[PDB]
Design an enzyme around this catalytic site. Structure first.
Site, PDB file in Angstrom:
ATOM      1  N   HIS A 208       1.306   5.842  -8.231  1.00  0.00           N
ATOM      2  CA  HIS A 208       2.112   6.043  -7.038  1.00  0.00           C
ATOM      3  C   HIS A 208       1.376   5.481  -5.832  1.00  0.00           C
ATOM      4  CE1 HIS A 208       3.127   8.533  -3.453  1.00  0.00           C
ATOM      5  NE2 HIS A 208       4.347   8.633  -3.959  1.00  0.00           N
ATOM      6  N   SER A 209       2.104   4.755  -4.993  1.00  0.00           N
ATOM      7  CA  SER A 209       1.578   4.275  -3.732  1.00  0.00           C
ATOM      8  C   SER A 209       0.582   3.141  -4.005  1.00  0.00           C
ATOM      9  CB  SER A 209       0.948   5.432  -2.943  1.00  0.00           C
ATOM     10  OG  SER A 209       0.836   5.090  -1.570  1.00  0.00           O
ATOM     11  N   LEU A 210      -0.673   3.318  -3.607  1.00  0.00           N
ATOM     12  CA  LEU A 210      -1.698   2.344  -3.956  1.00  0.00           C
ATOM     13  C   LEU A 210      -1.783   2.309  -5.483  1.00  0.00           C
ATOM     14  CD1 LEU A 210      -4.233   0.456  -3.365  1.00  0.00           C
ATOM     15  CD2 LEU A 210      -5.530   2.593  -3.013  1.00  0.00           C
TER      16      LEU A 210
END
Ligand SMILES: [Ca+2]
Ligand SMILES: [Ca+2]
Ligand SMILES: [Ca+2]
Ligand SMILES: [Ca+2]
Ligand SMILES: [Ca+2]
Ligand SMILES: [Ca+2]
Ligand SMILES: [Ca+2]
Ligand SMILES: [Ca+2]
Length: 615
Positions: A208-210
């Site tokens: 998730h995200s990075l």
């Protein structure tokens, strides 16, 4: 044909769903419940006047949740809960010893970035075993921004530098992130997998995200690296700023009002990166809304949407991803969804849930089109559909629905559920088949609503202009203070019923079984064969033939220029009835997978566009 919003490559629908569930579980796990305090504070005190309290709870939790800070003995052990959840999903961490990995891990088995500049990267390596102890699949999860609680600030700073370089760094930065952070690890995992008779296809990769960036990065490197072992791996990336789309390897799932999701175009920084960036990407779910207190709020939204606007980051938090997207996956309407379906996910705090309608505001996003799915919570929801075609799901709790028009399906779910028409009851035709409530508005729009105990209207007099009035939905009719108003319907049961319409019937409900529904000279009748294979004998003019969900295989006699077919929530993605038609001698067959209707003695060129609704 619909494959589900989380459809992946050429998987069958259930394989996709199972994979999605695994990916989200391991993606979530990489964060070790860092946002547990935020989850509690958000729901308890919200994002408005209670925001200061929410933020504090996010830092130090309570006796019921653990914030970002470690070592407070009155917090629960949220790390243990995190591990419990991933193990319940079928996964357990594989140790460095099991892998023979010479790199760095911490006491929780987390793997750390291998190269200078990437040492605050975190990965999880897990396995799914049979009831027999054999290894069945491998899961690789990359952490988004943040790190172990005990080194939270320092680790987060490392991550933020990596985040900045993805936008402002070398063209190849995002693509290299995973190679540089976990090049050796991934090689050891490949050797491990192979030694256990597993191939690249037995691996799910998420984050998730990075961590989403990292998913797309591995995918980007998977043809040329690690002997190509991970070329056919399953890449499911959450809230990624980036997309790797060559070769169809990755599905990018996120919320459109999450400013991190798709912030980069491919991997490039663009003007929209710093504002609204809702241009649709081929690999992405482009139209899922996180309907939370920020999104709902006119006041918050006087400020421009932007990743530079910190309050907008509310929509990015991993707990919204875990909880909200699991409800999407488990939705009774899932098999009707596509990658780019408009899906509004209820994520309100307890502060606003009781006074805020969940609805398609279409805020900070391209204009939505196609049907709209609104997914409730297991709490008491206020859910409002638009003027188009809506699929509203209450789930548990006592839910209230409104809908502004068009053709709709409503699943009250458990609890005491209300449908609120917002106007005089006389303006709506109401019938009931014993289980499902049918509402037709003044423009012919039709709603099917299951598990509705109360029909609420708004009535008026020369004296009082907005009285709300509840009508208990019973088998015998609508029950109110004025008395018991029956339905103008002939209603069958589980059996193969023969139903002849009487003079003032306006509706015929066959229900289950193979029913014969016979019209009358006056026409103006609505035929609902229901499930099973039904015979529909249209007589006279202005008849409607209504079909929803899996409606079995019907035969329709008597169809004419003044009649109408309405299909709602049926198999097939096309909005053009021609795509469902084949002529078989004098009979026109409209086929919907497992369901179909054969119009006897009819041809398609005699049917006008006004005569058919696909909703
Ligand atoms: Ca980190
Ligand atoms: Ca969108
Ligand atoms: Ca609910
Ligand atoms: Ca409900
Ligand atoms: Ca609607
Ligand atoms: Ca029946
Ligand atoms: Ca039937
Ligand atoms: Ca039927």
């Amino acid at each position: 044909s619909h494959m589900g919003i989380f459809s992946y490559k050429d998987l069958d629908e259930n394989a996709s769903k199972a994979l999605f569930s695994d990916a989200l579980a391991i993606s979530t796990y990489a964060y070790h419940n860092i946002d547990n305090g935020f989850d509690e504070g958000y729901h308890q005190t919200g994002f408005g006047l209670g925001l200061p309290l929410t933020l504090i709870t996010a830092l130090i939790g309570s006796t019921q949740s653990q914030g970002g800070l470690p070592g407070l003995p009155w917090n629960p052990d949220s790390e243990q809960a995190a591990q419990e959840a991933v193990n319940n999903a079928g996964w357990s961490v594989i140790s460095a010893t099991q892998l023979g990995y010479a790199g760095k891990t911490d006491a929780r088995g987390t793997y750390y970035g291998e190269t200078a500049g990437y040492t605050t990267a975190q990965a999880e390596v897990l396995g799914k075993y049979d009831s027999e102890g054999n290894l069945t699949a491998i899961g690789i999860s990359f952490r988004g921004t943040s790190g172990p609680r005990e080194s939270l600030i320092g680790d987060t700073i490392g991550d933020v530098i990596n985040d900045l370089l993805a936008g402002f760094g070398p063209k190849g930065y995002a693509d290299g992130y995973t190679l540089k952070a976990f090049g050796n690890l991934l090689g050891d995992v490949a050797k491990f997998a192979q030694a256990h008779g597993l191939s690249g296809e037995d691996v799910v990769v998420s984050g998730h995200s990075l961590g989403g960036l990292a998913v797309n990065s591995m995918a980007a490197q998977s043809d040329a690296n690690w002997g190509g072992f991970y070329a056919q791996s399953n890449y499911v990336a959450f809230a990624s700023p980036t997309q790797y789309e060559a070769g169809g390897k990755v599905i990018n799932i996120g919320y459109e009002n999450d400013p991190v999701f798709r912030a980069l175009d491919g991997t490039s920084l663009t003007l929209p990166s710093l504002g609204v960036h809702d241009a649709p990407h081929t690999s992405a779910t482009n139209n899922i809304v996180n309907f939370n207190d920020h999104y709902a709020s006119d006041a918050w939204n006087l400020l421009p949407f932007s990743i530079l606007n910190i309050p907008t980051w509310l929509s990015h938090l991993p707990f919204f991803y875990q909880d909200g997207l699991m409800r999407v996956l488990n939705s009774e309407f899932y098999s009707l969804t596509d990658k780019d379906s408009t899906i509004i996910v209820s994520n309100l705090s307890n502060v606003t849930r009781g006074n805020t309608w969940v609805e398609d505001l279409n805020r900070n996003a391209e204009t939505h089109s196609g049907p709209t799915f609104i997914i409730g919570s297991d709490g008491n929801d206020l859910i409002k559909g638009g003027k188009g075609n809506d699929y509203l799901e209450g789930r548990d709790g006592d839910d209230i629905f409104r809908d502004a028009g068009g053709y709709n399906l409503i699943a009250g779910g458990k609890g005491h559920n209300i449908f609120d028409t917002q106007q005089a009851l006389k303006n709506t035709e109401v019938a009931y088949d014993g289980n499902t409530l049918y509402l037709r508005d003044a423009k012919g729009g039709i709603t099917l609503a299951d598990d509705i105990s109360t029909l609420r209207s708004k009535e008026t007099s020369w004296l009082i202009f907005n009285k709300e009035v509840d009508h208990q939905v019973t088998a015998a009719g609508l029950k109110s203070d004025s008395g018991l108003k029956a339905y103008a319907a002939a209603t069958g049961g589980d059996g193969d019923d023969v139903l002849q319409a009487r003079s003032h019937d306006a509706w015929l409900f066959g229900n289950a079984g193979n029913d014969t529904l016979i019209g009358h000279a006056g026409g103006n009748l609505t035929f609902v064969g229901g499930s099973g294979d039904d015979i529909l004998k249209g007589v006279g003019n202005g008849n409607t033939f209504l079909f929803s969900g899996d409606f079995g295989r019907d035969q329709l006699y008597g169809f004419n220029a003044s009649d109408k077919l309405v299909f709602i929530g049926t198999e097939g993605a096309s909005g053009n009835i021609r795509d469902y038609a084949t002529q078989q001698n004098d009979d026109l067959v409209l086929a919907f997978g497992h369901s179909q209707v054969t119009l006897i003695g009819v041809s398609l060129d005699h049917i006008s566009t006004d005569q058919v609704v696909l909703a």
